[PDB]
Write an enzyme that holds these catalytic residues in place. Structure first.
Site, PDB file in Angstrom:
ATOM      1  N   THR A   2       7.113  32.682 -62.736  1.00 56.62           N
ATOM      2  CA  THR A   2       7.808  32.373 -63.987  1.00 56.62           C
ATOM      3  C   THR A   2       9.255  32.024 -63.855  1.00 56.62           C
ATOM      4  N   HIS A  15      -3.463  37.045 -67.110  1.00 56.85           N
ATOM      5  CA  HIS A  15      -3.473  38.072 -66.052  1.00 56.85           C
ATOM      6  C   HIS A  15      -4.612  39.082 -66.300  1.00 56.85           C
ATOM      7  N   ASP A  43      17.801  22.931 -44.098  1.00 60.03           N
ATOM      8  CA  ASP A  43      18.366  22.714 -45.452  1.00 60.03           C
ATOM      9  C   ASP A  43      17.697  21.524 -46.174  1.00 60.03           C
ATOM     10  N   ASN A  99      10.325  36.260 -58.649  1.00 59.79           N
ATOM     11  CA  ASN A  99      10.505  37.208 -59.751  1.00 59.79           C
ATOM     12  C   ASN A  99      11.207  38.510 -59.267  1.00 59.79           C
ATOM     13  N   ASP A 111       4.192  30.002 -71.048  1.00 61.05           N
ATOM     14  CA  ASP A 111       4.039  30.665 -69.746  1.00 61.05           C
ATOM     15  C   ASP A 111       2.556  30.695 -69.370  1.00 61.05           C
ATOM     16  N   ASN A 167      18.938  23.448 -39.290  1.00 59.80           N
ATOM     17  CA  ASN A 167      19.416  24.513 -40.235  1.00 59.80           C
ATOM     18  C   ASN A 167      18.520  24.594 -41.495  1.00 59.80           C
ATOM     19  N   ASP A 192       5.186  26.544 -67.271  1.00 63.56           N
ATOM     20  CA  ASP A 192       5.886  26.882 -66.020  1.00 63.56           C
ATOM     21  C   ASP A 192       4.942  26.847 -64.778  1.00 63.56           C
ATOM     22  N   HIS A 193       3.653  27.182 -64.958  1.00 66.85           N
ATOM     23  CA  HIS A 193       2.653  27.291 -63.838  1.00 66.85           C
ATOM     24  C   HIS A 193       1.320  27.523 -64.487  1.00 66.85           C
TER      25      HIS A 193
HETATM   26  C1  LIG Z   1      19.066  19.838 -54.141  1.00 63.66           C
HETATM   27  O1  LIG Z   1      20.218  19.498 -54.989  1.00 63.66           O
HETATM   28  C2  LIG Z   1      21.331  20.331 -54.687  1.00 63.66           C
HETATM   29  C3  LIG Z   1      22.486  20.083 -55.667  1.00 63.66           C
HETATM   30  O2  LIG Z   1      22.967  18.763 -55.411  1.00 63.66           O
HETATM   31  C4  LIG Z   1      21.780  20.176 -53.234  1.00 63.66           C
HETATM   32  O3  LIG Z   1      22.628  21.266 -52.953  1.00 63.66           O
HETATM   33  C5  LIG Z   1      24.013  20.963 -52.724  1.00 63.66           C
HETATM   34  O4  LIG Z   1      24.121  20.571 -51.348  1.00 63.66           O
HETATM   35  C6  LIG Z   1      25.384  20.501 -50.668  1.00 63.66           C
HETATM   36  C7  LIG Z   1      25.187  20.616 -49.114  1.00 63.66           C
HETATM   37  O5  LIG Z   1      24.260  21.664 -48.659  1.00 63.66           O
HETATM   38  C8  LIG Z   1      26.326  21.636 -51.106  1.00 63.66           C
HETATM   39  O6  LIG Z   1      27.642  21.216 -50.786  1.00 63.66           O
HETATM   40  C9  LIG Z   1      28.405  22.327 -50.223  1.00 63.66           C
HETATM   41  O7  LIG Z   1      29.114  22.996 -51.271  1.00 63.66           O
HETATM   42  C10 LIG Z   1      30.112  23.951 -50.914  1.00 63.66           C
HETATM   43  C11 LIG Z   1      30.761  24.456 -52.216  1.00 63.66           C
HETATM   44  O8  LIG Z   1      29.718  25.235 -52.766  1.00 63.66           O
HETATM   45  C12 LIG Z   1      30.013  25.878 -54.036  1.00 63.66           C
HETATM   46  O9  LIG Z   1      30.268  24.932 -55.084  1.00 63.66           O
HETATM   47  C13 LIG Z   1      29.155  24.227 -55.664  1.00 63.66           C
HETATM   48  C14 LIG Z   1      29.632  23.316 -56.812  1.00 63.66           C
HETATM   49  O10 LIG Z   1      29.927  24.048 -57.998  1.00 63.66           O
HETATM   50  C15 LIG Z   1      28.085  25.247 -56.095  1.00 63.66           C
HETATM   51  O11 LIG Z   1      26.967  24.646 -56.716  1.00 63.66           O
HETATM   52  C16 LIG Z   1      27.637  26.110 -54.904  1.00 63.66           C
HETATM   53  O12 LIG Z   1      26.526  26.915 -55.301  1.00 63.66           O
HETATM   54  C17 LIG Z   1      25.811  27.533 -54.188  1.00 63.66           C
HETATM   55  O13 LIG Z   1      26.317  28.808 -53.768  1.00 63.66           O
HETATM   56  C18 LIG Z   1      26.226  29.887 -54.725  1.00 63.66           C
HETATM   57  C19 LIG Z   1      26.532  31.202 -54.018  1.00 63.66           C
HETATM   58  O14 LIG Z   1      27.722  31.023 -53.301  1.00 63.66           O
HETATM   59  C20 LIG Z   1      24.833  30.031 -55.378  1.00 63.66           C
HETATM   60  O15 LIG Z   1      24.849  30.813 -56.563  1.00 63.66           O
HETATM   61  C21 LIG Z   1      24.141  28.695 -55.693  1.00 63.66           C
HETATM   62  O16 LIG Z   1      22.779  29.004 -55.951  1.00 63.66           O
HETATM   63  C22 LIG Z   1      24.307  27.697 -54.518  1.00 63.66           C
HETATM   64  O17 LIG Z   1      23.634  28.199 -53.368  1.00 63.66           O
HETATM   65  C23 LIG Z   1      22.884  27.181 -52.639  1.00 63.66           C
HETATM   66  O18 LIG Z   1      23.735  26.295 -51.882  1.00 63.66           O
HETATM   67  C24 LIG Z   1      24.511  26.927 -50.836  1.00 63.66           C
HETATM   68  C25 LIG Z   1      25.479  25.936 -50.165  1.00 63.66           C
HETATM   69  O19 LIG Z   1      26.503  25.594 -51.097  1.00 63.66           O
HETATM   70  C26 LIG Z   1      23.553  27.647 -49.858  1.00 63.66           C
HETATM   71  O20 LIG Z   1      24.285  28.372 -48.885  1.00 63.66           O
HETATM   72  C27 LIG Z   1      22.582  28.585 -50.613  1.00 63.66           C
HETATM   73  O21 LIG Z   1      21.657  29.112 -49.707  1.00 63.66           O
HETATM   74  C28 LIG Z   1      21.836  27.882 -51.760  1.00 63.66           C
HETATM   75  O22 LIG Z   1      20.909  26.955 -51.204  1.00 63.66           O
HETATM   76  C29 LIG Z   1      28.866  26.884 -54.361  1.00 63.66           C
HETATM   77  O23 LIG Z   1      29.227  27.923 -55.278  1.00 63.66           O
HETATM   78  C30 LIG Z   1      31.115  23.414 -49.878  1.00 63.66           C
HETATM   79  O24 LIG Z   1      31.864  24.525 -49.445  1.00 63.66           O
HETATM   80  C31 LIG Z   1      30.423  22.747 -48.667  1.00 63.66           C
HETATM   81  O25 LIG Z   1      31.390  22.137 -47.786  1.00 63.66           O
HETATM   82  C32 LIG Z   1      31.253  22.435 -46.351  1.00 63.66           C
HETATM   83  O26 LIG Z   1      30.533  21.417 -45.652  1.00 63.66           O
HETATM   84  C33 LIG Z   1      31.278  20.194 -45.703  1.00 63.66           C
HETATM   85  C34 LIG Z   1      30.461  18.904 -45.555  1.00 63.66           C
HETATM   86  O27 LIG Z   1      31.100  17.894 -46.317  1.00 63.66           O
HETATM   87  C35 LIG Z   1      32.467  20.297 -44.744  1.00 63.66           C
HETATM   88  O28 LIG Z   1      33.174  19.076 -44.656  1.00 63.66           O
HETATM   89  C36 LIG Z   1      33.399  21.376 -45.289  1.00 63.66           C
HETATM   90  O29 LIG Z   1      34.364  21.626 -44.291  1.00 63.66           O
HETATM   91  C37 LIG Z   1      32.638  22.671 -45.656  1.00 63.66           C
HETATM   92  O30 LIG Z   1      32.521  23.421 -44.450  1.00 63.66           O
HETATM   93  C38 LIG Z   1      33.259  24.678 -44.486  1.00 63.66           C
HETATM   94  O31 LIG Z   1      32.408  25.761 -44.868  1.00 63.66           O
HETATM   95  C39 LIG Z   1      31.349  26.018 -43.934  1.00 63.66           C
HETATM   96  C40 LIG Z   1      30.401  27.076 -44.514  1.00 63.66           C
HETATM   97  O32 LIG Z   1      31.082  28.313 -44.615  1.00 63.66           O
HETATM   98  C41 LIG Z   1      31.929  26.376 -42.537  1.00 63.66           C
HETATM   99  O33 LIG Z   1      30.928  26.604 -41.566  1.00 63.66           O
HETATM  100  C42 LIG Z   1      32.903  25.292 -42.021  1.00 63.66           C
HETATM  101  O34 LIG Z   1      33.361  25.602 -40.680  1.00 63.66           O
HETATM  102  C43 LIG Z   1      33.963  24.978 -43.127  1.00 63.66           C
HETATM  103  O35 LIG Z   1      34.946  25.993 -43.321  1.00 63.66           O
HETATM  104  C44 LIG Z   1      29.335  21.749 -49.149  1.00 63.66           C
HETATM  105  O36 LIG Z   1      29.850  20.569 -49.735  1.00 63.66           O
HETATM  106  C45 LIG Z   1      26.238  22.041 -52.597  1.00 63.66           C
HETATM  107  O37 LIG Z   1      26.945  23.248 -52.845  1.00 63.66           O
HETATM  108  C46 LIG Z   1      24.791  22.276 -52.982  1.00 63.66           C
HETATM  109  N1  LIG Z   1      24.685  22.701 -54.388  1.00 63.66           N
HETATM  110  C47 LIG Z   1      23.774  23.537 -54.886  1.00 63.66           C
HETATM  111  C48 LIG Z   1      23.822  23.785 -56.385  1.00 63.66           C
HETATM  112  O38 LIG Z   1      22.875  24.106 -54.234  1.00 63.66           O
HETATM  113  C49 LIG Z   1      20.599  20.263 -52.292  1.00 63.66           C
HETATM  114  O39 LIG Z   1      21.056  19.840 -50.972  1.00 63.66           O
HETATM  115  C50 LIG Z   1      19.406  19.389 -52.737  1.00 63.66           C
HETATM  116  N2  LIG Z   1      18.281  19.615 -51.826  1.00 63.66           N
HETATM  117  C51 LIG Z   1      17.654  18.619 -51.147  1.00 63.66           C
HETATM  118  C52 LIG Z   1      16.531  19.037 -50.216  1.00 63.66           C
HETATM  119  O40 LIG Z   1      17.962  17.413 -51.333  1.00 63.66           O
HETATM  120 CA    CA Z   2       5.156  32.286 -66.034  1.00 60.16          CA
HETATM  121 CA    CA Z   3      19.765  19.901 -41.815  1.00 66.61          CA
HETATM  122 ZN    ZN Z   4       2.271  35.634 -64.954  1.00 70.28          ZN
END
Ligand SMILES: *[C@@H]1O[C@H](CO)[C@@H](O[C@@H]2O[C@H](CO)[C@@H](O[C@@H]3O[C@H](CO[C@H]4O[C@H](CO)[C@@H](O)[C@H](O[C@H]5O[C@H](CO)[C@@H](O)[C@H](O)[C@@H]5O[C@H]5O[C@H](CO)[C@@H](O)[C@H](O)[C@@H]5O)[C@@H]4O)[C@@H](O)[C@H](O[C@H]4O[C@H](CO)[C@@H](O)[C@H](O)[C@@H]4O[C@H]4O[C@H](CO)[C@@H](O)[C@H](O)[C@@H]4O)[C@@H]3O)[C@H](O)[C@H]2NC(C)=O)[C@H](O)[C@H]1NC(C)=O
Ligand code: CA
Ligand code: CA
Ligand code: ZN
Ligand code: Y4N
Ligand code: NA
Ligand code: NA
Length: 805
Positions: A159, A265, A687, A180, A121, A685, A308-309
């Site tokens: 961290t 620190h 993203d 954190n 760390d 959006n 980590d940093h």
């Molecule tokens: C970095 O790499 C990552 C990993 O590859 C990339 O992120 C992926 O991007 C995808 C698109 O944004 C996303 O796919 C969506 O997944 C939905 C299912 O999600 C759950 O399942 C997965 C798989 O196990 C899981 O990992 C998810 O985890 C997220 O959510 C939980 C909390 O709920 C968190 O603990 C976790 O940290 C993570 O959060 C992050 O992602 C979510 C989005 O999933 C954000 O909201 C958070 O802020 C945070 O960033 C979930 O548990 C699935 O439902 C989606 O499908 C919708 O869209 C499709 C398009 O094909 C559409 O056809 C469908 O109809 C559907 O739409 C419906 O739902 C809409 C929303 O309510 C609604 O408006 C409509 O009208 C419909 O009803 C979609 O496929 C994937 O989950 C994430 N994965 C992760 C781990 O983040 C990331 O993009 C990369 N970044 C870059 C810059 O490249």
């Molecule tokens: Ca640290």
């Molecule tokens: Ca976008």
């Molecule tokens: Zn520190």
């Protein structure tokens, strides 16, 4: 409630955690206050310390001792790590010459080289050189294995966001550990470093390496450690696990050190008090390596030494107070320190307004040491917006400073002299990476890279399929001797149309005018060749970009530039052109100032129109291929084609025009020619991914012309600048940016000055990787080069940081 009346006998540091109310004996039980009554006595032995001495050699085993020097300790797997040195005439690992590990040399029953991740760390990158005299074990790992001069952490450089990024390959916005400290408004719950809420798995998204491993049949526990377990006991526990029977033994292990961060620190990154913590961490590495050598594993295990940093000089006197800017300071909640996150104190207060808070914080004091942003306006390279736990209002704090709400926060809390958290391109925040073992290369230096890439490599080291993550798998193949991931290029999804001349001028009613009605067989066939692609090898140096989604688009060729024109978005997705070192800059001629020309290859129905711009009093336009860089007065006409026009706020046009008129030629002079690809990005959006048409929130008034949220450029030349960009035999060099398309220059406090004093500074802040642009556009670049695909993946992950040495 814990029934702590159970016992740890035969269970010390058990790998499977037992379920409540049964008492625990695993390495996290202390954190939960759930260890069995006899855990300290049985599992945290300290008698006689951690080292063998001459008098202990061949001792009669005494089970009270912390570690053993009896003859049976090797078969028990519980010798002190220096046993063979003290008692058996062996050398310390650090004193052995380094010898290449060409193949794994593993004991029978080992199915794969184990991986040991040794995380430190606050270990600033420059400690590797500045502290090298006091860290001989670490210096041997670095010099004999594979090392980078530094590794870039994720933002914020705190961290928990970084250690969890190391474990998942994900940006903090996607894994959810975005600081954190956090408030999740959906949970209505708060996460902190101290306390139990953070034990709840609902905060922790993605799939960490221990879970990836376990699902694929590779044994691995979590990488967390209870803080009160001394480091010497952590090392002995790892060495003991490595002595388990084959079917019981993990394949991946994690050691964590709270140092040097803890002392940093208190003392600052280079406080004289910092030598001793660096010595102590080196000694711990020496214990591990000696222990591996005892177990005949020192040429079997892959070891990753990773931070980590880093750590910067930060003192209580360098604090900005929001009470010196805001009248309403009691109506806000601030997450403070080396970054700021602001939200309303009460969701019942409808007189709270982010616009007035941002304005009250923008360029208010001449030396102001923080800059406010709505999160969607932060540099896209930080990837810090797409999570409900990230407050809409963000303060980017200058290195060496803090932000706090009021003075009483800082003295009813000078203690500290170091801190971290700042922008992850800041030199002081950089950290370390060394890999040593059979799978890593020997005596090899690799370029700096980002920590989001390491999860894939750890998966490669373990033969695992990584969960979907933000690394670019293959971009770190050059770190590895074996186990490389040979990626294939993604398939193109949409093929382009190649339109010829299909419309007459009078079919257009776009409200545009151009003074171009001023009139040769030599030079007519020539202009026809240009429109068919005769100069394309000059301006499209690395193949056309592939479009990786379903859409309708046309390739348009011209003398000076080539473009992929979208019939759906009414503008190019990309425009490619090469500018040699010898290129001349010219003006837009007077008679051409307002010239826009219909493109007779593209239907009026799929074109922009000038009337929309005339009517939208907020919006003007610019061009992707710049008229200033035309090859001849006649080729300049192509630059005013309606198919080269894009919507631009006047404030943004100040930026773009200076880039096009001054900076492109500057780069071509410095780099010996450049190839430029430029285009729009739509990310309403926030993203980080290309918007579909139905996500566009803003159009040029009264039209279907969508307004980009950003404009990008990718600027490529020969790494060997003795060769011109367009005749390059070897590796490439790139810099890119993703500029926000904003209706003001409120971000640049010096914008009232000439562009030469602020525009390049803006561009540097919005530096980007080609991969960032790929995500934001659905395009795949560098499809036709003479280079290996892994080398191109490394080039696409490069970030030009503009920091010095
Ligand atoms: C970095 O790499 C990552 C990993 O590859 C990339 O992120 C992926 O991007 C995808 C698109 O944004 C996303 O796919 C969506 O997944 C939905 C299912 O999600 C759950 O399942 C997965 C798989 O196990 C899981 O990992 C998810 O985890 C997220 O959510 C939980 C909390 O709920 C968190 O603990 C976790 O940290 C993570 O959060 C992050 O992602 C979510 C989005 O999933 C954000 O909201 C958070 O802020 C945070 O960033 C979930 O548990 C699935 O439902 C989606 O499908 C919708 O869209 C499709 C398009 O094909 C559409 O056809 C469908 O109809 C559907 O739409 C419906 O739902 C809409 C929303 O309510 C609604 O408006 C409509 O009208 C419909 O009803 C979609 O496929 C994937 O989950 C994430 N994965 C992760 C781990 O983040 C990331 O993009 C990369 N970044 C870059 C810059 O490249
Ligand atoms: Ca640290
Ligand atoms: Ca976008
Ligand atoms: Zn520190
Ligand atoms: N996505 S999932 O569904 O798989 C759930 C993943 C999260 C999880 O398993 N838990 C269950 C265990 N929890 C927990 C329990 C006791 C603890 N005791 C001490 N410390 C300090 C420490 O280890 N600091 C160093 C450290 C090392 C590695 C890393 Cl990655 C990090 Cl971020 C920090 C802790 O962090 C700590 C944490 C966290 C949530
Ligand atoms: Na206008
Ligand atoms: Na300004």
């Amino acid at each position: 409630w814990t029934a702590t009346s159970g016992s740890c006998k035969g269970r010390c540091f058990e790998l499977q955690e037992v379920g409540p109310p049964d008492c625990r004996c695993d390495n996290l039980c202390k954190s939960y206050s759930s260890c069995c009554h006899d855990f300290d006595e049985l599992c945290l032995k300290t008698a006689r310390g951690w080292e063998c001495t001459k008098d202990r050699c061949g001792e009669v085993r005494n089970e009270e001792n912390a570690c053993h020097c009896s003859e049976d300790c090797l078969s028990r797997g519980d010798c002190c790590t220096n046993y063979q040195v003290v008692c058996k005439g062996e050398s310390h690992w650090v004193d052995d010459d380094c010898e290449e590990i060409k193949v794994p040399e593993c004991p029978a029953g080992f199915v794969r080289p184990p991986l040991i991740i040794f995380s430190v760390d606050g270990f600033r990158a420059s400690y590797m050189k500045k502290g090298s005299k006091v860290m001989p074990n670490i210096e041997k790992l670095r010099s004999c294995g594979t090392h980078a001069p530094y590794m870039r952490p994720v933002y914020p450089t705190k961290t928990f966001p970084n250690l969890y990024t190391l474990a998942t390959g994900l940006y903090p916005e996607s894994h959810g550990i975005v600081g954190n400290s956090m408030y999740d408004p959906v949970f209505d719950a708060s996460f902190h470093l101290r306390g139990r809420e953070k034990f709840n798995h609902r905060w922790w998204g993605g799939q960490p390496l221990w879970i990836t491993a376990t699902k694929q049949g590779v044994r691995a526990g979590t990488f967390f450690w209870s803080v009160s377990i001394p480091h010497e006991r952590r090392i002995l526990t790892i060495l003991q696990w490595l002595s388990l029977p084959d079917n019981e033994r993990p394949s991946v292990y994690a050691f964590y050190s709270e140092q040097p961060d803890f002392s940093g620190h208190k003392y600052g990154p280079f406080g004289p008090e910092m030598t001793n913590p660096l010595r102590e961490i080196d000694k711990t590495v020496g214990q591990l390596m000696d222990g591996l050598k005892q177990l005949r594993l020192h040429r079997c295990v892959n070891v990753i030494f990773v931070g980590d940093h880093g750590m910067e000089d930060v003192t209580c006197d360098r604090t900005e107070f929001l009470s010196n800017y805001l009248t309403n300071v009691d109506d806000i909640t601030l997450v403070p320190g080396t970054l700021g996150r602001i939200r309303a104190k009460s969701i019942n207060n409808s007189k709270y307004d982010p616009k007035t808070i941002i304005a009250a914080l923008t360029c208010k004091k001449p030396d102001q040491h923080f800059k406010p942003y709505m999160k969607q306006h932060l540099p896209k390279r930080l990837h810090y917006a797409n999570n409900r736990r990230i407050e809409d209002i963000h303060l980017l704090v200058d290195r060496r400073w803090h932000v706090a709400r009021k003075p009483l926060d800082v003295y009813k809390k000078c203690f500290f002299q170091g801190d971290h958290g700042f922008d992850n391109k800041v030199n002081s925040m950089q950290t370390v990476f060394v890999g040593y073992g059979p799978t890593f290369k020997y005596r090899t230096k690799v370029p700096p890279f980002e920590n989001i890439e390491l999860y894939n490599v750890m998966c490669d080291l373990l033969g695992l399929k990584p969960a979907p993550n933000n690394g670019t798998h293959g971009s770190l193949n050059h770190l590895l001797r074996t186990n490389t991931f040979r990626p294939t290029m993604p398939d193109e999804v949409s093929r382009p149309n190649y339109p010829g001349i299909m419309y007459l001028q009078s079919e257009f009613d776009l409200g545009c005018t151009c003074d171009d009605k001023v009139e040769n067989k030599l030079e007519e066939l020539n202009k026809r060749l240009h429109t068919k692609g005769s100069t394309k090898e000059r301006h499209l140096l690395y193949g056309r970009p592939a479009v990786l989604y379903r859409t309708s688009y046309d390739i348009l060729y011209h003398t000076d530039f080539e473009s992929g024109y979208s019939e759906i978005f009414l503008m190019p997705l990309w425009t490619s052109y090469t500018i040699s070192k010898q290129a001349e800059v010219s003006s837009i001629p007077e008679h051409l100032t307002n010239c826009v020309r219909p493109d007779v290859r593209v239907s009026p129905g799929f074109s922009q129109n000038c009337l929309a711009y005339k009517n939208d009093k907020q919006m003007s336009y610019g061009f992707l291929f710049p008229p200033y860089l035309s090859s001849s007065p006649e080729a300049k006409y192509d630059a005013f084609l309606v198919t080269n026009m894009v919507p631009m706020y006047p404030a943004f046009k100040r930026v773009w025009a200076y880039f096009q008129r001054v900076l492109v030629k500057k780069y071509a002079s410095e780099r010996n020619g450049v190839n430029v690809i430029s285009g729009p990005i739509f990310d309403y959006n926030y993203d980080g991914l290309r918007d579909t048409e139905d996500e566009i929130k803003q159009y040029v008034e009264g039209s279907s012309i969508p307004v980009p949220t950003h404009y990008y450029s990718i600027i490529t030349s020969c790494l060997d600048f003795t060769q011109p960009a367009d005749k390059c035999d070897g590796p490439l060099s790139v810099s890119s940016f993703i500029l926000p398309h904003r209706p003001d220059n409120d971000e640049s406090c010096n914008s009232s000055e000439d562009e030469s004093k602020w525009v390049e500074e803006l561009m540097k802040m919005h530096t980007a990787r080609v991969r960032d642009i790929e995500h934001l556009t659905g395009l795949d670049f560098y499809r036709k080069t003479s280079r290996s695909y892994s080398e191109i993946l490394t080039l696409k992950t490069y970030l030009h940081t503009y920091e010095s040495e």
